[PDB]
């Protein structure tokens, strides 16, 4: 039995040089810290983070107002409370102290999702200490999962970039590699790292040294015009690295970015100077293109294949490929219960991309994960473009028994601290853990 | 008081995706962790790392051997010792357990510079805890410096890359910006981040979206042909940010990369295809070229202006710039006492670039810093190309009261990791600390 003795927040910088919020919760057991990744300050479905909007500081991206919220609103309301009452603390902040609710659920507009999550994670971390348990086992406790035979997740490393993250012709946003065939996660990380360096070398020699400079998530943005060229580089790299058959491929289309709202078309050539009518596809036809790549390449997962509001296409694609392939819903679900329930009723997808700061609290993150799992869906915990030194999602993925996680390329320490944390988790557990492997989407 | 109960180590990944060692020293006061950055497994001056060299694991960069060394050689030797005796522990490893050496001091080859530094830093963290002091203050007591009016360092952020780190025409390796005009470290960081983003979008318009991708240290590699083109971008970036006069420039030439041994001349166009742009320059002319830029642009520091062994030039350059510009030694010194002493005698520099894993231990890192400081030189704590999420050098630079630190651009968390740590330290100390500012070369004393 411990209680919240103090709560102080501060402004720190995320992986991209932009301010983010870090919180320190104190109990008789010590000081507990949590740093929140970056999200969206404006939006219609997701939880909005509070930013100063002062052009004279950090180009308007400061979080001082957020720091003051924690001190002036959240602190006085939590002093004396038991940090182990995760649900009580999260619902107090979200429903009572804030209460700002849009038509899709609580927005967390007044206090800001960033201020709330910071406290939620810090209390969650203080609670684990109060119970004398490592973070991963404590999360499992909150989710109703068991603390033995915990599943280590399959990591999804970003490798090739397109869409709005590159000047190349590639329309899809991300191409990743996933070592499902590794015996354990420490090896999974090696397979990933080696294949990644091999790919770097290939790019260095073909596209030049400057093409080996990385993007926000640590991936490369070589001058490839089509998905086929991207997919070809990956298969060559995997084979050359010696992991043919042990490392699979996955991609994030981010189709919303190339969707033509009125005519209801998807323009695979939205970046090309000379436009081709043959590439302005309807949902049903875009589907067939993906189905073409699935039979030709070892693709095991597809994220945001269509616009965030095109449930028709999602449903059709999932109906055709759902059994043997994973269809992740990111922008379409936005880690939102109501959005998920609608997806479930329409069988839009079969996997939830879980961005914790997108929903705002740990309790809400957990219920969303549980809803997906109870419905037969898989769950992939995700990082953000703007991450931090905090490895929370690493313990989260293990505690929620997802057996699946994408947290960037094996490059840039905001991505690696998560992967490093997973390896420590694995040592600690030792024989008391198993690797998701081929069962990443539905762990045993 | 408390003693060492156990020492373990594991293999983690550094910022470039290469393995490195992480050590956990345990006492009754808890478990203390330390991760070391990348170094070099070969060289004739510096402390050498121990790499597995296994053709089939991590391209020969594994560190399982280093991890086993800690377990079978170090651990048994340290169990029961007080973690506070930093010097006793550091010398037990460097001189007795290891003992290997070259004509420039102990190399730390048998146990590995990485295994020893990992242990040294972990114990240092355990010692701080024993004494009941934050790591930075504990380091101050080891260096024999006061813990009352501590000094925050001026940060040197990487911004434009060249030489071997870029396919562009720029011969110099790094260009940095330093907010000497900021009132405190948190402001210095803001100034840096703002100027960095202003630079980012200037580059975006003139070179395109791909040109904004970052290198190992978070900086950019725009296709600029000369130093003049690079300096103009920085001047422009600084003015757009509104910090003209408050943010100065610095650069690391890494001149060794463009020195022609056979000719004994430097080539600023060594990357150009056609090789007749301009004749190669001697130390003399190269100096004049730098002095030329010192008048043109607000450059306050120059690192590795000449070849790793060209003391004649260094001396000549340091002599006529003297009090108005900082001249850092990196490759020429390689954080080696005996090298520092030769450079001191020859007046080759007026500042030391301190790379803690290059010398091997915290104790040696401290005497190196103390040797520089008491001889009229500055000390600039530095990061490595391959960093980790360990913010140790943040507390080191504060504890040593250096007044200056380079730890990458305000991009990539292995870099922000250190900058964020400096801001926490500043909060902790509150009204009980000062910003080096204008005095970054030699922080003013307290009275």
Author numbering:
A (entry chain A): 1 to 444
B (entry chain B): 1 to 447
Sentences copied from the publication:
Universally conserved across the three domains of life, enolase (EC 4.2.1.11) is an essential enzyme that catalyses the dehydration of 2-phospho-d-glycerate to phosphoenol­pyruvate in glycolysis and the reverse reaction in gluconeogenesis. Toxoplasma possesses two enolase isoforms that are differentially expressed in a stage-specific manner.
An apo TgENO1 crystal structure was determined in space group I4 to 2.75 Å resolution. The crystallographic asymmetric unit contained three nearly identical TgENO1 homodimers. The larger pentapeptide insertion EWGYS forms a short β-strand (β5) between the α3 and α4 helices. The insertion produces a more positively charged surface potential at this N-terminal domain loop. The dipeptide insertion KQ, which is between β11 and β12, also increases the charged surface potential of loop L3 in the C-terminal domain, providing a possible site for binding to ligands that will negatively regulate the catalytic pocket. The interaction of the N-terminal domain of one subunit with the C-terminal domain of the other subunit forms the TgENO1 dimer interface that buries 1891.7 Å2 and contains 33 hydrogen bonds and 15 salt bridges. While key catalytic and ligand-binding residues (TgENO1/human ENO1: His165/159, Glu174/168, Glu217/211, Lys355/345 and Lys406/396) are conserved, TgENO1 exhibits three atypical residues (Glu164, Leu176 and Gln380) in the active-site pocket in comparison to TgENO2 and other enolases. However, a comparison of calculated surface electrostatic potentials indicates that the nuclear enolases (hENO1 and TgENO1) tend to have a higher degree of positive potential than the cytoplasmic enolases (hENO2, Streptococcus pneumoniae ENO1).
